[PDB]
Design a protein around this ligand. Sequence first.
Ligand SMILES: Nc1ncnc2c1ncn2[C@@H]1O[C@H](COP(=O)(O)OP(=O)(O)O)[C@@H](O)[C@H]1O
Ligand SMILES: [Mg+2]
Lengths: 524, 524, 524, 88
Amino acid sequence: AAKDVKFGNDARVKMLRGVNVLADAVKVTLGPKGRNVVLDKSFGAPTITKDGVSVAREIELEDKFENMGAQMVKEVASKANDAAGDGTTTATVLAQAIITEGLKAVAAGMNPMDLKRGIDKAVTAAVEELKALSVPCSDSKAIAQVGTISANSDETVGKLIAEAMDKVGKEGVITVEDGTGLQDELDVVEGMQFDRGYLSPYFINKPETGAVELESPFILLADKKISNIREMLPVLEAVAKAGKPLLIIAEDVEGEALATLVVNTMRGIVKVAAVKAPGFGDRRKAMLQDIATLTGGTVISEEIGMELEKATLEDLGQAKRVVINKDTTTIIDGVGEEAAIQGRVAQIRQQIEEATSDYDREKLQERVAKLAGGVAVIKVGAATEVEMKEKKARVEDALHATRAAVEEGVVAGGGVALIRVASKLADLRGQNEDQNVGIKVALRAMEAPLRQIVLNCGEEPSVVANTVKGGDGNYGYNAATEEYGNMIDMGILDPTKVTRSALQYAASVAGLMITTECMVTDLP
Amino acid sequence: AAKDVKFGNDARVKMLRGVNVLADAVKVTLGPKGRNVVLDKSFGAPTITKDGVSVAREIELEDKFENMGAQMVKEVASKANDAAGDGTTTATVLAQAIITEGLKAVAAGMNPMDLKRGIDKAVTAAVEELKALSVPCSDSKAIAQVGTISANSDETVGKLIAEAMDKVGKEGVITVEDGTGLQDELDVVEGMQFDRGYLSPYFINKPETGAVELESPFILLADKKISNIREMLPVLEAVAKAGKPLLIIAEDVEGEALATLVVNTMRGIVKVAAVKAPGFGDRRKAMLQDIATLTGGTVISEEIGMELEKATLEDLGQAKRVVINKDTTTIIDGVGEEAAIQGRVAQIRQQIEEATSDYDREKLQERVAKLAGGVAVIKVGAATEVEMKEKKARVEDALHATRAAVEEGVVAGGGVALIRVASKLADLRGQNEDQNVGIKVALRAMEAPLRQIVLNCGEEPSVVANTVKGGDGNYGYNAATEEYGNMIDMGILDPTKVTRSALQYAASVAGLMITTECMVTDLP
Amino acid sequence: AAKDVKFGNDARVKMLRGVNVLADAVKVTLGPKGRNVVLDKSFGAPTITKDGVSVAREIELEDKFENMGAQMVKEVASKANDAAGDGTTTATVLAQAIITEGLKAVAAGMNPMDLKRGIDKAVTAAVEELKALSVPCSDSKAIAQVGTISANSDETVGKLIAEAMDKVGKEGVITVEDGTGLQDELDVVEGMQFDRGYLSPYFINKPETGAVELESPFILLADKKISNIREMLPVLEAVAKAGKPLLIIAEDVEGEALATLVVNTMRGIVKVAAVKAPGFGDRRKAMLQDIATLTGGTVISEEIGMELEKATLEDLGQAKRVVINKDTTTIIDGVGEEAAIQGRVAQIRQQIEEATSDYDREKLQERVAKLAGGVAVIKVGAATEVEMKEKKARVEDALHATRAAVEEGVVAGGGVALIRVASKLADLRGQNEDQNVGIKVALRAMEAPLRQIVLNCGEEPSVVANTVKGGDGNYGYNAATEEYGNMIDMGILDPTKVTRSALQYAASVAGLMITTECMVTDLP
Amino acid sequence: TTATVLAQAIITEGLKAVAAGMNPMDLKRGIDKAVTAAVEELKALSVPCSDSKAIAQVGTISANSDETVGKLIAEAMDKVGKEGVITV
Ligand SMILES: Nc1ncnc2c1ncn2[C@@H]1O[C@H](COP(=O)(O)OP(=O)(O)O)[C@@H](O)[C@H]1O
Ligand SMILES: [Mg+2]
């Protein structure tokens, strides 16, 4: 592997060229009145979308190094969506702005480490301004209000989201299911959600979601890392005759067993998926058991002397639904007996009695919440299947926004909040002159999302930015209606958390690029 | 896969070039005296046709992006035909006209978003003028009149179309079968049509039609998604022994079973086709049953406890004919007994009495119509197979025109209707100056189909258009006879619905391209 | 699948260039003294022939578009031969003549649509003149006279042809068989000929003929489309054991069974062929049965409940000979008992009494003729096999000429008739000036076959044409003898039908090219 | 500019006739004969221009419809007379 290596400006300029291509294409779709982009499939007609996230995913550059820059931004921007649910397009816009002006500063002979430090300082100061700016969203009115707005003026969608949170609680678990009929159903049923992803991207049966949905699947509980194919066979065949999907929970699965299942699921005999068990060490023992009680399943432990081959359907637990995304696994309506599950809760509540550690009482309390809290599930009813799934997508988008809105409140969505904060900290300075430059770059970059939106609309960015600066608080310009006033009242807003994370991620990658003196890649 | 990205003028110019190639070729065949096009097949001699749709299917460009523009137009133009039945070429002609003048306008420095908005207003305004212009077709005389015209001046074809509608109804189900003999037969037999397409395009045994015809096939009714090949094997083998085709209805079929059935059907031992069940969720449960009663078959449900493997011929319903197109499935002359079918209808009629809600009452009423209304069929008789088969194609073409004529009436078909409407709203203005320009582009573009018709004929486009402008209503020039008068009375007309659909689709794609800043494709 | 597309002159010029090479090479062999062409074989030495058909068949061009022009002419020219038996070369000559001037006319700026119309009018008028010019062939002396002249001045060939027609009838079925002995045998035996060709070109065991000859084959009669390999297996081996060819008559055969049979016959275990059954719908029910009675076989009907697997040799009819060409199938000397066949005729004669409709009477009558009339056959005898096979080819060529001569009479064959007709209607004019030009183009083109004949000979085309123009009726120049007089009396003539068919086909393709504005082909 | 246009139309149509298998020299004679007759027609059609406004109108039309030009020119010709010399 012969390496091509670039240093300083040759390296950084190449990244700049790469990032600009990615950002220039994606940014046009940011505003309510965005400009559509055309992507092309290998066999068939071209594809047009105003979705920045779809455009960004597809982008790759021939020139190594330039490609690297785009990928670096895509990685961080994708993360903002992962931790916020929106702002992926906004993060990229901000990243471009911070990077371009800051990058020029290093090329001008100014010190890069200080510029990063200055930018970070501006970012840290900026985040507090958003927090002061931020309007809380804790009550029923705000929960429904943000949910309906996100849902594109659909009051009913917001109403169920509020009801769900109201019932299970803000931190509770809410899931979305296809509607059995026209009426919308909100129900609380035994179930559990935990942090853990799928072992392979190949397992996914729902490409747009990036998640795996299974119908009334059997559930396998295991106490060891799976190092071999052979253990699965007697149970694997048994589920195959049943004609239903199989779900596996264990410490880890090795490639010899994992790879065959991946190949087996993809154009194969039985389509199954497996995930890692929640917790570690001593905790997984209790954690796995809670799931067993919930699904009415049997736990299999190597330590006990029980092996996977020695297992049957009776050992396996069941649930009506299970959905697995990139890092989260959740189950709906386990078949475990109510007496068993309620009884299990009593045992855990009793356990909480020692209160030996803040950690142990907290940890036990969390287990209670996962097992006894239950899972709130919403069915979406509609006149037609197309409307039903489409509405369902809208509900899920609103739900992510509602959770982000709840956690940190909300800010004006027209990119107004960045504008408002940028004008607010004109005063902040750094010890080194180079640091001051980093600060200006960061604040100047903040303005860009507003201008981009206005630019997309075909309106003058400078005129609108100037007027917005004049006004204060949540006051701003609504690009969609061509009006000025309180953006939140209008319905144009973004969760505080998403604006914060987009901005922070943009700064993290920008500083990271600024301090890079070398790039290594394979030759063309 | 490194991406080549085009944006701004570079992106738009390539789309323009791509659309012009597609439109220039296809437009020549639009007129009654349209010029022919030569397509060269990879095997044997070249093929000459005056059919624009055939030419459109063949058009692909070497230059990526430019190719995309053509494909984008083809997709939308095909859709107009799909929702209408004719005017695929007309839509393409209009698309070219709107795109070229509007695209020049964006290049000039005008705002694209406003131009789209202006065009949309003009398009929307044009549709009401078209509605007023339109001559209604509700009477037997009108039904026959449009039917015979479409059928290339064959009165007998028109007479049957009117008779069919007169029995089952305007919204009823009409099907065409090869004639058993010389005499034309119109019959009403038990049968059902529903809006569900075929999972695999490979299933089609009739390449010109794009539909699947089966003779006295067995019918499988299932209540689950099919993910495994093996369930099908005992029933599958049983039908093969029979020596005749098998039809499958269920939630959906996965690639594991679908791919093998597709391969099994093409150059394989048993050739069968499958479609999705009508309705959704709770609703499908009753509808699948309706089909079962109609064909004398047995419904199979997972919930009940019966599996596909545990099934036999006695469990399968039968019909003399079934035909499946790209998005519709219909069955003819099911073997279900009259006592069962009529009784089933009574059960549904009884259900209607509850009247809890309009949605459920109506929904039940729709079920009654499908199950009890019956399916009218047409057999076409001739002394020679060539005449018989050719006549059948003509009947079907006339039928689509008659349905479109019925639903929205008819308009002069010489391109005259676009001319008449364009002249009528010469005072329409937008807000922004750019919006006004979009309006002029849209109305000006309307003229092109007339001019194209006359141009193909080798006659003066401007002089004929000038005289046509002078006249009022349905007055215009008949390209076929080189005469002026009422176009509808001359036997030249298009359904109101096809003219509208062509115009609307052309505007949708044109505006869509105008608003697109960036295009993405793979490198050469 | 990128496409290269040409419009107007760029498209038309390529067709012109393509047609000219096809026509320039083929035209040299048209005269009795025609020049020879050298075709190179992939294996072995080069081949020289004066046969225009072999030359034309072989020609293909590198330049896409130019190739299309040649192929377009070849298809059309081949069709003239298909519907006339001769004039394949003459059609191409006429096509070149009309195409070259017509293309210049469009190039000159005159309207193509009108030019086509003018040419067609000239064609229609010229055909009418040809009909008046033509000397009818009705009586035995004319029948024998044309047969002997076609047969290269052999009286015996002519004598048998006249006798055959005089026996079974002008419209009856006459076949040619290898002579069992030295003497010529003309016999009338039970047999049937119907319109229907072979399903696969691969089946042909006689490549010069393009027909399939089978000796005393077993005959399978079936009433369903055959889509499966399996039904033939029990019957197929039984014929293999026999060591004789098998013939199949049914609705159709699908690629599943057809493709395997094609491979099986070609370089495989059993060599057999299958054709489509005559008639359609209930008509075929009667048509298949007549054949069964004729061969002593048993018809197998799905509706009866009988299956191909359930069939044996006893259910198969037999005939001493069967020959299948591109669209004609005939059987000779079927086994079927005379009492059965003759009795079957009695049932049909009885059926005629119903007289429900003119169509039914005629259709029943046709069945009588096919069965009761019998098939007249000719055994060609000679001392040596080389003389015998050669003589047989000559008989077949004479037979086609005799059928054409019978249907429309005969005309001078030196291309004199085109000369005579072209001079006769110098009067004809069109409403549009462009049409008048088209008329001259068509008339002028007519002269070329005469000139080509003289040109090939080595004599002045203009001097001979000039003298011929001066004369009247069938008077003209005989290229073979270099003399002037009545061409028909001199032994040189063409059937009226071949002259007409060549001329009309040339006109059809020429006009078709003239109105073409676009050509599509794959890149080099 | 007007003369050039006539050459354009005559030539294109004339060549087209030549293409149509016609002797060009005869076509030239036809053209020349038609032209001679056309010239005679113009002499009969011509209306005398003697008043100042008519002179102004030709000046205005010649000067790409500039009214001021026609106005100023008419004044000059009237003043200097028939044989007067006017320059710019
Ligand atoms: N407003 C007008 N309307 C109609 N014809 C006009 C108008 N103005 C000028 N013309 C005519 O067109 C001709 C060409 O104008 P011009 O540019 O002066 O060409 P020349 O340079 O005269 O070929 C004039 O001689 C006149 O007959
Ligand atoms: Mg001038």
